[PDB]
Design a protein around this nucleic acid. Structure first.
Ligand SMILES: [Mg+2]
Ligand SMILES: [Mg+2]
Ligand SMILES: [Mg+2]
Ligand SMILES: [Mg+2]
Ligand SMILES: [Mg+2]
Ligand SMILES: [Mg+2]
Ligand SMILES: [Mg+2]
Lengths: 127, 99, 100, 151, 206, 114, 79
RNA sequence: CGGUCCGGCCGGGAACUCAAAGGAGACUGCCAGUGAUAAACUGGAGGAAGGUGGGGAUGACGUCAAGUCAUCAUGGCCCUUACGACCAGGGCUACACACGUGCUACAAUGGCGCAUACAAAGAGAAGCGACCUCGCGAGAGCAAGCGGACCUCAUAAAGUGCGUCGUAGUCCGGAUUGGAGUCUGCAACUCGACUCCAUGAAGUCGGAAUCGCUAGUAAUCGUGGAUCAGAAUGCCACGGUG
């Protein structure tokens, strides 16, 4: 049976499936390099596969909807780590230290009445 | 074939209680019942100026949540059709019959 | 608003359904058909002879109680002030103070 | 910062070499929240600087940084109507932060063809200590040795 | 400062709506003006009949008016004599058929609208405002209210400089959403202007 | 290089070099090089006298330079002699199209004076 | 400025232009119609166009065809 | 998993994303240090979340005879063959100027051309209006679906890939004006929006002085909505990068 872990950050939601053998990455029926045009966004998904060793040890079928580049990439990082604990559960110690277990609750703040943006207040005039 | 019931109500604890009545009445009188399916709520937001004259930043922000429920009954048994038709449901719930 | 300004709207509605709903719409679609009559129509001329208030665009959306021509909401048919007044009394169904 | 005694946000290291100091530098250069185009200018300037100075991309940054890094600065203090400039010893963290900030501000004030070129030539001038950025550490030094009595 | 309507803020928490019907954007405005027009008729007709609340619900293509009153006998009449003449014109105003229900208001001295309307009707008879307020407070506290607050604003007793006076007995936690606060207004149209009555009755938490 | 209205185009790319004429913007410059069979990303260098005159004959079709300047000025004077609103404003040095004069109308009025 | 599908003209003024052609040129034609487009059948006539208070008499010319009657009657007094 | 027009598209599967109702959870509870053994603070463990976790709603007695008799209601006063009422045209859009709030800039962290990856939240029958066809285009003709997690508005733009311009009042910047048009509307002269062609102002970063913002904030980049026949650089709301 497939090892599953859900990951999300911002408005992005990523589903991660783990199966042993090879070092393949398929994101929404596309390759890792084909989907993300940034190498910084490519390295964040490679992050869980550093502390926990993998070169050609296990494959990953991943799908992500919503948000943007860093949002989707960040969501996948959380998913892999959740699928990794699903497979062992003793990997929690190494995953906490790196801060990948934690869901980043940072969402965009709402626009408030009287304000130009979320916090940006219109220019003040004394006289 | 199949009978499609679409429920709309501004109150949530009124829609699923009237839905519970439709699902139970159908499954009791021997019918195949799919759902209660919870469809997305349409949040009609409104922003009104709270002052009768001037005071642009002072505002009241309201919403009208329109809750949606889908109940699909597979077996149109005469024991089920007649049981559902003579059912007294909350006056604040709109029922859409889809054949 | 004024009783006269309220009455002026009743006249603008009565004439909107009498002509520009069943008669003036027929001559405006005609003044658009390229296939038939490209010069001798008189439909553009006979539209003028019809009362002015009869046009639907000449009507102003006014608060259904006070007559306020400003701060109108179609959803309730009232101005922001009388919307708030009824909202707080629970006279508007499903409407409550929202926060997100 | 009156009552609240806050710490400091630990930022993620550089995606290329893994330097926290460079991650501070890309952010300092960054404008309009465009990190992609910001690291593209920092990496192109580092590629043109290390090549035209004899490799060691981490060390070529460090040589230019040691010349702009200040030791002392003045703090404006109104005691008796008059505004006194008190000389104060800067902390190691802010030492680098001021050094990096002047490198970016001096390269922005340059007249070259690109920001990757403007940065490289400013990092070249700082490595030999003869630019607008090393002069900003110099003016800060003359201000501190003057008000040396009010220490 | 300015306070939030105690009824409005509690709608959905511990307070119910006065309009329970559902409608789409199409007839929402048409129903709202029909609601205003029906309440307007009934408040004018049943003025001496102590009407506290009016609830409108629309089952399909019909209107179901639930008149909350402290004097149901005068509203009903001689074996439905008065209910029949009311329903007949409610159906005319609304367009759709009408069905009027009468809900008994047991302790009216605990109803905000009825307390407020009592102060208003007293101020128009030339009673002293301080006496009217104290009587409203005392009657409510002796009948079980956990608290009461009554406010009268503008030209009190004919005075040239308008004042805002208030009497408060018990607990009135206006910040606790959980609390049952019954709030209503009334206007006394006096020979020397308009006097605004505001009543808050705290009945207990949850 | 010298085309139609006396002007001497620089040794820049064909499409930008042709915009130098008064009466040819970005659209006419793209259409003139498409009709004469010349590339847009090619300089004045290599463009022989046989390729210059074929563009001169192409640009001769539309009113350019001095011929266009008098045509624009004629329509301005026409409004002015007519006595129309549009003419009374070309005569008063104020915004003709309808723009506000209470404030910001400095392009037409010119720089302010106390 | 408008759709090519028919230039606009008021019927009360168009009938006044017709009556002036057959019966010959009279005194200035008192009209409030500022929205009407000038036609070739107007050249030579004196149309008194309103400004808000008085009727500005304008002698129709061939170059005036296509323009509105209200362009030759100033609405705002500026001195 | 079975079948492929390689489209979840069709049988199916209720696993997962999500939808929306109910419920759990975080309390200085644990440990340690500081501190009058107290309160509390600091750090750590566990935990998705840690010290009111993030945001909102909530605004005490009262202050400024502070704002609103032009939303409405109303004591008093005033007009009542007129301060009322109807109509056409005009004005609210005037322009020697001064101040406040904004948008767009002054450019290579950028302009342009082609190729292309990734949202969120809304609106809709007197409506949103696809596909197809015509027009450089704004649009127009023809005409499906959809009172809507189904259909439509609607291609997100920043970003990334390649090429070009090479510090120039410029392939920056778009004002102003000339010519021709589109749509809505009885009707676009005064005084609408938008398109096409041409024009190519000022401005190369702003004196004295001054404003916002402490984290998913500022900065920037798009998207939707209310009003609305038509008329957003305003307002209200939304996520992207950060
Ligand atoms: Mg009135
Ligand atoms: Mg209108
Ligand atoms: Mg040109
Ligand atoms: Mg929940
Ligand atoms: Mg509180
Ligand atoms: Mg005052
Ligand atoms: Mg340009």
């Amino acid at each position: 049976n497939q090892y599953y872990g859900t990951g999300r950050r911002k408005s992005s939601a990523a589903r991660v499936f783990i199966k042993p053998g090879n070092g393949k990455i398929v994101i929404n029926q596309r390759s890792l390099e084909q989907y993300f045009g940034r190498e910084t966004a490519r390295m964040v998904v490679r992050q869980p596969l550093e502390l926990v060793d993998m070169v050609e040890k296990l494959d990953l079928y991943i799908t992500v909807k919503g948000g943007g580049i860093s949002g989707q990439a960040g969501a996948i990082r959380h998913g892999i780590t959740r699928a990794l604990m699903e497979y062992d559960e003793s990997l929690r110690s190494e995953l906490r230290k790196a801060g990948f277990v934690t869901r980043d609750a940072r969402q965009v703040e709402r626009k408030k009445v009287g304000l130009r943006k979320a916090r940006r207040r219109p220019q003040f005039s004394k006289r | 074939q199949r009978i499609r019931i679409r429920l709309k109500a501004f109150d949530h604890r009124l829609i699923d209680q009237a839905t519970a009545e439709i699902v139970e009445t159908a499954k009791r009188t021997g019918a195949q019942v799919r759902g209660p399916i919870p469809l997305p709520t349409r949040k009609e937001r409104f922003t009104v100026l709270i002052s009768p004259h001037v005071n642009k930043d002072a505002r009241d922000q309201y919403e009208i949540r329109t809750h949606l429920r889908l109940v699909d009954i597979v077996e149109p048994t005469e024991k089920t059709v007649d049981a559902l038709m003579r059912l007294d449901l909350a006056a604040g719930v709109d029922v859409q019959i889809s054949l | 608003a004024k009783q006269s300004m309220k009455a002026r709207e009743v006249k603008r509605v009565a004439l909107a359904d009498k002509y520009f709903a069943k008669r003036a719409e027929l001559k405006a679609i005609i003044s658009d058909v390229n296939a038939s009559d490209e010069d001798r129509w008189n439909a553009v001329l006979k539209l003028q002879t019809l009362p002015r208030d009869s046009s639907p665009s000449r009507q102003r959306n006014r608060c259904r109680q006070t007559g306020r021509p400003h701060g109108f909401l179609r959803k309730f048919g009232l101005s922001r002030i009388k919307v708030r007044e009824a909202a707080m009394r629970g006279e508007i169904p499903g409407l409550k103070k929202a926060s997100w | 910062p009156r009552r609240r005694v806050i710490g400091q946000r630990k930022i993620l290291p550089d995606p290329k070499f893994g330097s926290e100091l460079l991650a501070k530098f890309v952010n300092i250069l960054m404008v309009d929240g465009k990190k992609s185009t910001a690291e593209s200018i920092v990496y192109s300037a580092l590629e043109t600087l290390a090549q035209r100075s004899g490799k060691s991309e981490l060390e070529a940054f460090e040589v230019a940084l040691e010349n702009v890094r200040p030791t002392v600065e003045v703090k404006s203090r109104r005691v008796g109507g008059s505004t006194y400039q008190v000389p104060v010893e800067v902390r190691p963290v802010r030492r680098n932060a001021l050094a990096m900030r002047w490198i970016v501000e001096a390269a922005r004030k340059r007249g070259d063809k690109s920001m990757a070129l403007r940065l490289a030539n400013e990092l070249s001038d700082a490595a030999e200590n003869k630019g607008t950025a090393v002069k900003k550490r110099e003016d800060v030094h003359r201000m501190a040795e003057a008000n040396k009595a009010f220490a | 400062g300015q306070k939030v309507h105690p009824n409005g803020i509690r709608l959905g928490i511990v307070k119910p709506w006065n309009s329970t019907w559902f409608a789409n954007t199409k007839e929402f405005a048409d129903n709202l003006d029909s609601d205003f027009k029906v309440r307007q008729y009934l408040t004018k007709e049943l003025a001496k009949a102590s009407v506290s609340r009016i609830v409108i619900e629309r089952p399909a293509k019909s209107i179901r008016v639930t008149i909350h009153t402290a004097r149901p006998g005068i509203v009903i009449g001689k074996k439905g004599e008065d209910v029949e003449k009311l329903r007949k014109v409610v159906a005319d105003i609304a367009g759709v058929p009408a069905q009027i229900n009468i809900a008994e208001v047991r302790k009216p001295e605990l109803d905000a609208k009825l307390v407020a309307d009592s102060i208003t009707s007293q101020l128009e008879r030339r009673v002293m405002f301080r006496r009217a307020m104290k009587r409203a407070v005392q009657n409510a506290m002796r009948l079980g209210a956990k608290g009461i607050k009554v406010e009268v604003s503008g030209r009190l007793g004919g005075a040239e400089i308008a004042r805002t006076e208030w009497y408060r007995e018990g607990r009135v936690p206006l910040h606790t959403l959980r609390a049952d606060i019954d709030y209503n207004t009334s206007e006394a149209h006096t020979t020397y202007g308009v006097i605004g009555v505001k009543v808050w009755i705290f009945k207990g938490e949850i | 290089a010298r085309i139609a209205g006396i002007n001497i185009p620089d040794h820049k790319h064909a499409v930008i070099a042709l915009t130098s004429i008064y009466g040819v913007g970005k659209t006419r410059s793209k259409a003139i090089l498409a009709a004469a069979g010349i590339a847009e990303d090619v300089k004045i260098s290599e463009l022989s006298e046989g390729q210059i005159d074929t563009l001169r004959d192409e640009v001769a079709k539309f009113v350019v330079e001095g011929d266009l300047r008098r045509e624009i000025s004629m329509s301005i004077k026409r409004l002015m002699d007519l006595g129309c609103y549009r003419g009374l404003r070309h005569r008063r040095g104020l915004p003709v199209r309808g723009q506000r004069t209470k404030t910001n109308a400095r392009t037409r009025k010119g720089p302010r004076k106390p | 400025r408008s759709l090519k599908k028919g230039p606009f003209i008021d019927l009360h003024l168009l009938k006044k232009v017709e009556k002036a052609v057959e019966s010959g040129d009279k005194k200035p034609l008192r009209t409030w119609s500022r929205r009407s487009t000038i036609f070739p059948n107007m050249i030579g006539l004196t149309i008194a166009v309103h400004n808000g208070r008085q009727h500005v008499p304008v002698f129709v010319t061939d170059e005036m065809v296509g323009h509105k009657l209200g362009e030759f009657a100033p609405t705002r007094t500026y001195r």
